[PDB]
Amino acid sequence: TSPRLASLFACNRHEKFRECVAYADESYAESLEPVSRLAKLGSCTAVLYPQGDFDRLPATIDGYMAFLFLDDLIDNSTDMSYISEITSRFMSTAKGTPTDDKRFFLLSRFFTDKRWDPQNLVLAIEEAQRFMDGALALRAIEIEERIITVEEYLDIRVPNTAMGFMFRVIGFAQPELAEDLNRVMAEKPDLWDRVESPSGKSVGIALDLFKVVCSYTNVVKIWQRESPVAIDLGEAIKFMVSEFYRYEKEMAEALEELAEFSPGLAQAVRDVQGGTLGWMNAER
């Protein structure tokens, strides 16, 4: 149930992907297993930053494993009090508060990595906060059993897909693009949002499709209630699949304007989106 999605964007692989896999394995064993899928974010960073600087990718691998680990505790949490404690610990860790807690150690290493461009780091922290606020809002909706529209959902969901976060990390993984990333955010935020918004919407749809019991915070179930005519799960999937292709077309059009501002940054965003989708499909 729920089909492969054919991204408009190529899935390209860093030359040193086999180094990425073996690093992901060793580092997971050492710093995370004491508290599986997580190491397979080795192969994944390799297809997110194919024109990245290999020397930046082990740090990125560690950051993403730690992020995936903690988000698993958040998404798998019943009550707001627990989720609030983890999210606030996440953000104080992203902001450099020291910790000797293996739930947070790899996260800390990534966010305190001295090679960050300083304004890229601030961008990354601010977007991580948007991700966390997104997760808190969605949990509260599921607990309240609040019926919201698809449109309300997707606007909340976009930061919580981590697409915008992975786009900010482009500046760390591919440091030749750090300056263009800062520039576009300071000078053309509207154009930037025309790219990132359909990206988060398409990938949020893809994510929700790929986990077909989360009834008020899955866009498939949400559209089931919103729909003007009764639809079953299979018909709701069909439509949201149609929506995924529509948002990707909107994103690609927006990337043509970004590309005249920065061809390099526009290509790196394409590669993040196409590697994300390539990997989700490949983990069939």
Ligand X SMILES: CC(C)=CCC/C(C)=C/CC/C(C)=C/CO
Choice from 9, 90, 244, 279 touching ligand X (CB under 6 A)? 279
Q: How far is the CB of 260 from ligand X (least distance, A)?
A: 27
Phi, psi of 78 (to 5 degrees): -85, -30
Distances (CA, A) of 228 to 89, 223, 224, 231: 42, 9, 9, 9
Q: How far is the C-alpha of 89 from the C-alpha of 84, rounded, in Å?
A: 8
Determine if 64 is a binding residue for ligand X (CB under 6 A). Answer: yes
Determine if 265 is a binding residue for ligand X (CB under 6 A). Answer: no
Tell me whether residue 71 or residue 208 sits nearer to ligand X (CB atom): 71
Choice from 10, 68, 122, 231 touching ligand X (CB under 6 A)? 68
Helix (H, G, I), strand (E, B) or coil at 273: helix
Phi, psi of 146 (to 5 degrees): -80, 130
Q: Which stretch binds ligand X (CB under 6 A): 64-72, 91-99, 221-229, 234-242?
A: 64-72
* Number of residues near ligand X (by CB under 6 A): 12
Q: Which of 152, 75, 34, 119 is nearest to 90 (CA)?
A: 75
Please, which of residues 154-213 interact with ligand X by CB under 6 A? 161-162, 165-166
Q: Which stretch binds ligand X (CB under 6 A): 23-31, 67-75, 89-97, 224-232?
A: 67-75
Choice from 49, 67, 69, 247 touching ligand X (CB under 6 A)? 67
Tell me whether residue 20 or residue 224 sits nearer to ligand X (CB atom): 20
Identity of the amino acid at 131: F
Tell me whether residue 42 or residue 224 sits nearer to ligand X (CB atom): 42
CA dihedral (158, 160, 166, 167) in degrees, to 10, reads 30
Determine if 223 is a binding residue for ligand X (CB under 6 A). Answer: no
What value does the CA radius of gyration of the chain take, rounded to a whole number of Å? 18
Q: How far is the CB of 160 from ligand X (least distance, A)?
A: 8
Q: Report the interhelical angle of 233-261 vs 189-210 (nearest 10°).
A: 150
Choice from 267, 276, 277, 278 touching ligand X (CB under 6 A)? 276
Residue 139 in tokens? 């949990």
Determine if 44 is a binding residue for ligand X (CB under 6 A). Answer: yes
Please, which of residues 144-163 interact with ligand X by CB under 6 A? 161-162
Q: Report the interhelical angle of 118-144 vs 80-94 (nearest 10°).
A: 180
Tell me whether residue 60 or residue 224 sits nearer to ligand X (CB atom): 60
Q: How far is the CB of 131 from ligand X (least distance, A)?
A: 8
Tell me whether residue 64 or residue 104 sits nearer to ligand X (CB atom): 64
Instruction: Count CB atoms within 10 A of the CB of residue 76.
Output: 9
Q: Where are the alpha helices (DSSP H) in 53-117?
A: 57-75, 80-94, 105-111
Length of the chain (residues): 284
Q: How far is the CB of 58 from ligand X (least distance, A)?
A: 14
Residues that bind ligand X (CB under 6 A): 41, 44, 64, 67-68, 71, 161-162, 165-166, 276, 279
